[PDB]
Each structure stands twice: as structure tokens, then as C-alpha cells.
Design a protein around this nucleic acid. Structure first.
Lengths: 106, 83, 23, 97, 91, 74, 95, 81, 107, 91
DNA sequence: TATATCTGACACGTGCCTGGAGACTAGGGAGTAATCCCCTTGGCGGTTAAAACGCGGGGGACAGCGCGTACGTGCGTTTAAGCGGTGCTAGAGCTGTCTACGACCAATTGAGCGGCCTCGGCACCGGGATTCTCAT
DNA sequence: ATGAGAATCCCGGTGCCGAGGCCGCTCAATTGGTCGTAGACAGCTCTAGCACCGCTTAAACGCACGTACGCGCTGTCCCCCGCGTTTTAACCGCCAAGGGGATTACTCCCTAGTCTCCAGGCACGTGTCAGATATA
């Protein structure tokens, strides 16, 4: 019976691959046991919230395939994802529609 | 290679107007265009002098997208969507 | 000295003065 | 026919280019700039096409950031036209200078 | 070789069971996961060297989350991670 | 023969001057290089100050000395 | 006599850019640090060198802001700096 | 335990900070503004320093913990370790 | 017989200490032989330049003991070192004496 | 325990044989040395991880120095770096 | 200010002790050579979208000018900062210890990757009815 | 003020090529054993952090007043915007050519590891000389 560690912890990210990347990435001499479980849960959580907001945007433009336009909108229309992804440019992402209020007519 | 001269003038006026109007710019003076050329020149110079040193440390003759992504991550300008 | 063919210092001469300049 | 007020077409283009996401610089002259600059470090270098596209996607995002900062520094001091003073002060407060 | 595309797609079908994702958006999610993995790993490495230790445990990443995520993201991620760790050790 | 002076901006000034010249002439020399007329150019050379009718030969001039513009329009 | 307004201010700039000492009083700065840190974890203790590090860091941060705010106010054809200028300076700065 | 304590940051202290900044004339609304700037800045640094100490299992915040918080926010500070 | 390796390279920074801090810094698995030599020479050069400029600043301000204000004045007055250490705060550092030209009332 | 202070003082006597530094200046120079050490080592590490190697060598440090140090500081640092490596290999 | 008399941080002796230096040894990282094929470079032409280029004009940049008010300057006063002791601890720091948690090896097997169909979300076209602008 | 008029959003056909769904298949995750040291924990020293009290004095503070300077208004001119015409080179597509990137196999030498030896830097005493001070 295989019973992989991600299914053992109730996650959908590869705990084994996170462990392999932590070992062969020279972050320390040793890697603890609960650490890849914790990383996999954290990464699965953050991609869950980003795909939540991206799906809301892609539905609000009446589409199904999420594109980097919806990724850009979902990230920039939330303060925490702004501060987390402040120095990040997204390819084919575009800009938020924002006009400075002085330039409006008249 | 053959001559390869004066491609900074390949950045035309209406292109700079397009980049300005993504930024929400309603009016644009005339002296901006040579300034924008001068700024974009030095920005590309920095990213290419990082990426070329990356390639020469890799002992290659081509410059890859991942070298560019590494050079941009280096200057605090991380780029997604190229690996 | 030894560290005079090994550094970078050419131009210009730099002033480091600070004057309490009263009256 | 008919003629618009000078600035309505400007607002039209601002709404348009903020809705759109394509690249704005022409690909062959940018793609030729890159080799102009890369001659100064090592001759006979080759480029992956995705590397050229990455340089486009980076430098256009940088210039969009510049003009949205100069727009703030030109609304400050109560103007509308960007002047090069705005670009100099933007790159100066950002620590690029 | 090797993406997170399969796993990101599983999270997507869990969240929105109808929408799809383009390849150019999937690659951005892939770069996202690599970015935040490298941030948290290189931060917990510095914590392990500032406290003169040699192992990286779940205590480390619980604080490395708290330094890197802002606001309520940290409070939810710490909770989600410890729920996963307790389910792992219980089973 | 080649004398320097710091400005209130913080900037040094490079200029060559014959070491028997007056002080009004070198205020004109620095006025050539800056945008400041000598109505507000108050100079200090090692504590004791400067007066325009005086010359460099009496004020300890050497190779590469320093002057300092300061302040105080009365 | 009486000095014209601005001359004493220029002399103060000449003084406080020549000096290097701490321009904020140390005990009220300490009590501020302790009551800010009171909210996160109750009943902490502080190395005095740590409070001095916070002192110098926050003073150097504010000096950086006031130089950038001075640039913004000169850009706006003024001499008085303003909270407008502070808010613009740190918004461009990225805060 | 402690009351309004940002008022210990006094008006002439902010004046000295601006005079070192190079400011010739200061409006009167800045004194309430820079107190908010200090409040934001010192909260953002002290939060990281406290989390560093709580991870290190101590009660004293140390100079190196302040240095690590400031280095994490991009302000490297020399002369405390 | 003893023959310290920093003296073999003709240096004054500790090559053995640099090699040890490379090996236990988790920078890589293995560490090359000439790596701490090259890095010790580079570190020694950077200290050499900053101490030379600080000595010039201390001699110009007529004091024979370099205080950290002289390091501040040495670093912030040249382009390459201020570009390197541009996000670095120095304890008891102070600021360069800069005054904007507009705030100088004429006549 | 353990500092670079002795070595900084030796370089100081070699450059300006008359001056001295106070202990605060020595602490700042010590923090300086530690900072540039960890910068260059952190860049050479990720150069080795990019190029899939596992030995940090002089070539790795040379390219990391050429990335980090601006202007002519790189052109001098590369020069005496190679001088010291050749003088070390001769003995 | 001469002469003399007191001071503190740095420059300079001692021991020590522990981390650096030396010899050897082997095993795996890495250099180097062949090879092979993807991808980049360089052509060619058609087309046409986009750049370039006048041209008028109107709206915004800028300079000047006046007003009043918020801010610099200066003086009394008053309030804490700072220094200088005092002591009293809570914790920082170090040491032994022993255990249980992670590295490592060998065998296995299911997960995830390269590859190959396929159909429908989406791009596009072609109207075709609505909705901001501007001289009235 | 508003009807003409340019955007302009939208409804419906059409085709397409990308997102997604199977299929071998192989290689990395798993399981299940030793083993050996990292660190958890108790315990002890002792040091520096915290409360405290009192004297001094200097820095904050409060107030009065006289401006320089912000801010609004006005005119004016110039220069940037909308628009119509020419013209130009970007782009699309196609088609060779080779070159350098990726792979694989083979060898080798270079760095980890262990052991032993010993001297260089840490720590801590001592002089010493720039700085402060009393009287005449």
C-alpha cells in the first residue's frame, strides 16, 4: 500500500517533491519532518486564494479560461496580494484601469 | 553587425505616447521623447550587462530567457511567465 | 606605499572640510 | 466637418490602452536595439526569441511605471503636461539616481 | 519537467469546478509557486543560521510565513499549515 | 596655482589662479563658474576671512589650497 | 538687531548637517518603543543597544523622507514642505 | 500600561530632523503627519524583531534582532554586530 | 614548516577562516580550492579602498583617529562606493552637507 | 570572537601608517566585511545552482564579483583576485 | 600661560588553546570528445498598418501682481531629560546527557510526464441597434 | 439646450487550434531497517535590565508680533492635439543552412574526510601620551 505523504496529510501538493527541493537546494544540512508538510499546505493555500480571485474575475468578464489579464486583476485588486507581489511584473498582464480624477471632463 | 546604428530612434513618438497613455497621461510635452529614449537606453544596458555575464559564466553563445529572468530578479524586477 | 598602484583614485581631488564659520 | 475637443481623444486612448494588454513597441526595432546594446559586451551573441520577448515585457512595464509616477509628480505642482522635470524627480525619489 | 501544473489544476478544479486555465496563465502560476517557495526556504535558512541550528523544522516555517506574508494571509496560512501538520502526525 | 573651493550645495569648484591675484578677481573667477554673484559670496580661508582689496601673496597661498563660501547677508 | 527670517534656519541646517548626534530625546523614544512593542507581546525586555539601533534607524529613515519631501516641495515651486509633499514622496518611494 | 507616548516625539525634534534633511521652512501640519510615519515605521520593524525573538525563545529583544528585522526590510544597519 | 596559506597568496585576510565560513555557510556542497583565496583578496581590496579614503577624510579634518563620520564622508562622496552601499545606514553617520540652491536668498 | 578587526587594522597600518580608528569605526568596518562576504557568497551559490554544478570555485566568485561591484571596482577586484590566485598556485 | 600635577583610551607586553595547517586517500564531480538536431540567422516578396508630416487653433503653461495669514524669531518659564548612584532580580549564557529523530541504503511500485486525438471556447465578421460629444 | 454623428456594445454565425483527456512507462516517492548525533532539558552562574530617588539644567513650551510667502486672479502666447495625406517598413509567410545547445560515455584529479601537530589570535594586563586643571 503506497499511501503518499500528501494524501497522508490531506493535501494536493507533492510533499515528496517539496522535501526533495528542500534537501537538494542547500537551505540547511538537515530537513525536519513536518517542514515539507507545512510548506505544501502554505503553497496550496496561496494558490487557492489566487485562483479564487482569478476565477471571480474571469467569470465577471464572462469567460472560462483564466488568462494573465485575470491574474493581474486578481492580484492588483487586493491589498495583501499587492504587498506580497509588489516587485512582480506579469507577462501579458496589462494595467489596472485607473484615471487620475483631475484629468476627467472638465 | 553590418552597421547596426541608431535603433534608439526606432522607439517612435506614438509608441511613447501609447506607453504614456497606459499610465493615464492626458498631455505630453515635446521634450519627453528624448528623455524616454535616454532612460530606456540605460535600463536595457543594465539588464543586458547582467545577462551577458550570466551567459559567459554558462560558457554559451546564446542568451536565454532564463538568463534574462535571472538578471531581472537580480535588480528587484522579478518577471513571471518565462519559467 | 604598496597600495598606490592597486587602487582607483584619479580625479578629482575631493574636499572633506567642515567649518563652524561664525561671526 | 466634425472635430473633437483636444483631450477627449486622449481620454479615449487612455481608456483603450488600459483595457488592452498587448505590447506597444514595434518588435523589430526593439529587437534590433537589443543587439545594438549587446554588441558592447560580446560580439556575435545570439538571442532566444523568448528572451527578446522577456526584455520587451520587462521594459514596457518599467516605462508604464515611470509615466504613472511622473503623472503624479506633474499633478503635483498643478500641471497636466508631463515635463522632463517630472521624469528626473521620479527617478530621483525612486532611488534610481 | 517539472511543473506544478497538475497540482495547480487540481486546486483549480476544487475551487471553480467549471473554469479553465490557459498555458500562459499556468506558467505564471508555476513561476509564482517557485518564487514563494524560494522566498520561504531562503528565509527559514537564515533563521536556522541565526539560531545556530542545523535542521529546518515546522517551527521555522511557521515564523518564516509570519515574516513574509502580510496581514490576514499569515493568520490563515499558519492555521492551514498547522492543521495539515496535525492531520499528518495524527494519521 | 590651482585652487579649490566648496559650495553650499556641497560641490567643489576647480579653477586655476595666479597666486598673487586679488580676492575680488577670484570672486569674479568663481562667479564665472557658478550662478552666484559676489554680493553674497562670503569666503573663509582657515579661520581668518577674506577682503577684496587683499591679495593671495599675504594669505598663505600654496599649491591646491581650499576656500569656503559660507553665509550671513547681514 | 533681529535676524531676518530664514537666516537662522539656514544656520540650523549648517549646524545639524555638521553634527552627528541623536536628534530625538532618548527616554521618550524608549517609552514609545516599549509601548509599541507592548501590543505584540506583553512583558518584553530590551537591550539598550537594540533601542539605540531603533533610534538611529528611525532617525535616518526620517532624514531620507525629509530630503525627498524637500525635493517635492521645490518641484512644486514652494519653500514650505507640506503633508501633500510627504504623501507624494513616500507614494513614489513605494510605501 | 502606557498612554499617548508618540507626543514625546516633540515639535522641535521634528524640526531638527527636517533641518538635517535640508528643509528651510516647515508647515505646521507636518508634526501630526510624521508621528504617523514613525508609528508605521516602528511598528513594521518591531513586529519583525519580536517575531525573531519569539522564534529564538527569549524575552529580551537584542541588537542583532533589530538588525535582522531592518535587513529584512532592506535597511542594513552597520555597527551593532 | 607552518606556512600559512594567506601568506602563500601574499594577503592579509584569513584564507583559512574564509574557507571555513564558506564550508559551513551552506553555500554549496563542495568548495573549490582557489575560492577563499579569490574572495579574501576581494574583501581585502574593498577594506583597503574605504580605509584609504577615510584616512584622507580624517587627515583633512585634522584628526588622526578615524571616527565613523569619516567613513560616512568617504563612502557618500564617490560614485562607485555610494552605488554599492546605497541602501546602508551607518551608526553615528550623519549626512553630507547638502543645501539646495533655491533656498539661498539673494541680496 | 570572532572578528576581522586585526586584519582591518593591519590593512590600515599598511595604507595610512599614522592614523587609527575608534572601536565604533572598527565595528562598522567589521559589519561591512560580513555584509560583502555574504553578498558575494550568496551570489556565487545561486550561480552554481543555475548552472547545475556543486563546487563554488574562483570562476564562480569572479562572475559574482563582476555582477556585484559596479564601475571600476569590479575591474580592480577581478585583477588582484586573479593575482592572488596565481600567487597562491605558484607556491 | 608657565610649571606641575592627575587622567582615560589606546597601544603594547604576557599566556594559552583551539582552530588552522600538513599528509594521505579515495571516489565522484567535472572536463572533454563525439554527435545530432532544434533553433536561430538570414534571405525573399506582398501588403498594409503605422509612422511621418503639415496645419490650424485653442487651451494650458507661465509670468506678473496683490492679499492676508500662517510661520519664523525672540523671551520668560516650566517641565522632564539626564546624570549619578543603588540594588535586585529575571533571564541570558554555558554545560552535561541521553534520546529520539533524521540521514542513508535497498527494493518496489504507482504517480506524473511525453505523446497523441478532439472538439468547443474563443477569436473574428457582419451587421445593427444603442450612447458620449459638440455646435445649437 | 440637442439632433447629428462617431463610438460602441452586442447578437449571432463560423471556424479553429488549444485545453483537456487517455496511454505507456519509468523513475522518483515509499517503506522499512540501522546509527549516530542534534538538540531537549535540567541545572547552575551572574550580568545586565528595570525600578527608584534626588539634583541640575537645558530644552520644551507658551505667547506676541511682524512679515515672506503661499495662493488666487489675469492675461497672453505658444505649442501640443486632432486630423487629413503620403510613404515606409513591420509583419506575415516561406524557405534553406548551419551552429551551437543538449546529450552520452569515458577518464582523472580535486576536494572531502581523518589524524596529528602547533602557532596565531583572544583575552587580559601595563605604559603612555594627548587632554584637563591648580596657582602665579
Amino acid at each position: 500500500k503506497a499511501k503518499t505523504r500528501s494524501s497522508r496529510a490531506g493535501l494536493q501538493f507533492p510533499v515528496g517533491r517539496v522535501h526533495r527541493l528542500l534537501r537538494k537546494g542547500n537551505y540547511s544540512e538537515r530537513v525536519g519532518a513536518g517542514a515539507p508538510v507545512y510548506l505544501a499546505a502554505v503553497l496550496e493555500y496561496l494558490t487557492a486564494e489566487i485562483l479564487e480571485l482569478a476565477g471571480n474575475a474571469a467569470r465577471d468578464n464572462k469567460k472560462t479560461r483564466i488568462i494573465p489579464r485575470h491574474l493581474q486583476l486578481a492580484i492588483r485588486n487586493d491589498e495583501e496580494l499587492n504587498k506580497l507581489l509588489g516587485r512582480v511584473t506579469i507577462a501579458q498582464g496589462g494595467v489596472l484601469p485607473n484615471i487620475q480624477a483631475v484629468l476627467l471632463p472638465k | 553587425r553590418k552597421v547596426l546604428r541608431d535603433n534608439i530612434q526606432g522607439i517612435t513618438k506614438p509608441a511613447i505616447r501609447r506607453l504614456a497613455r497606459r499610465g493615464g497621461v492626458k498631455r505630453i510635452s515635446g521634450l519627453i521623447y528624448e528623455e524616454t529614449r535616454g532612460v530606456l537606453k540605460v535600463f536595457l544596458e543594465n539588464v543586458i550587462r547582467d545577462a551577458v555575464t550570466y551567459t559567459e559564466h554558462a560558457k554559451r553563445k546564446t542568451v536565454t530567457a532564463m538568463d534574462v529572468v535571472y538578471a531581472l530578479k537580480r535588480q528587484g524586477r522579478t518577471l513571471y511567465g518565462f519559467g | 606605499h604598496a597600495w598606490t598602484h592597486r587602487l582607483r583614485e584619479r580625479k578629482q581631488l575631493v574636499i572633506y572640510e567642515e567649518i563652524s564659520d561664525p561671526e | 466637418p466634425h472635430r473633437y475637443r483636444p483631450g477627449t481623444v486622449a481620454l479615449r486612448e487612455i481608456r483603450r490602452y488600459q483595457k488592452s494588454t498587448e505590447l506597444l513597441i514595434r518588435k523589430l526595432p526593439f529587437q534590433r536595439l537589443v543587439r545594438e546594446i549587446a554588441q558592447d559586451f560580446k560580439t556575435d551573441l545570439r538571442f532566444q526569441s523568448s528572451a527578446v520577448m522577456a526584455l520587451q515585457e520587462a521594459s514596457e512595464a518599467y516605462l508604464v511605471g515611470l509615466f504613472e509616477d511622473t503623472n503624479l509628480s506633474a499633478i503635483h505642482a498643478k500641471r497636466v503636461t508631463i515635463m522632463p522635470k517630472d521624469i528626473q524627480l521620479a527617478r530621483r525619489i525612486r532611488g534610481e539616481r | 519537467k517539472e511543473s506544478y501544473s497538475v497540482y495547480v489544476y487540481k486546486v483549480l478544479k476544487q475551487v471553480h469546478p467549471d473554469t479553465g486555465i490557459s498555458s500562459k496563465a499556468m506558467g505564471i502560476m508555476n513561476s509564482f509557486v517557485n518564487d514563494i517557495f524560494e522566498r520561504i526556504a531562503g528565509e527559514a535558512s537564515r533563521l536556522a543560521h541565526y539560531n545556530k541550528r542545523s535542521t529546518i523544522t515546522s517551527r521555522e516555517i511557521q515564523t518564516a510565513v509570519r515574516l513574509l506574508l502580510p496581514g490576514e494571509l499569515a493568520k490563515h496560512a499558519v492555521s492551514e499549515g498547522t492543521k495539515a501538520v496535525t492531520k499528518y502526525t495524527s494519521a | 596655482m590651482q585652487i579649490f573651493v566648496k559650495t553650499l550645495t556641497g560641490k567643489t569648484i576647480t579653477l586655476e589662479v595666479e597666486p598673487s591675484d586679488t580676492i575680488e578677481n577670484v570672486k569674479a573667477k568663481i562667479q564665472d563658474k557658478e550662478g552666484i554673484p559676489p554680493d553674497q559670496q562670503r569666503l573663509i580661508f582657515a579661520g581668518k576671512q577674506l577682503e577684496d582689496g587683499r591679495t593671495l601673496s599675504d594669505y598663505n597661498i600654496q599649491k591646491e589650497s581650499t576656500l569656503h563660501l559660507v553665509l550671513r547677508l547681514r
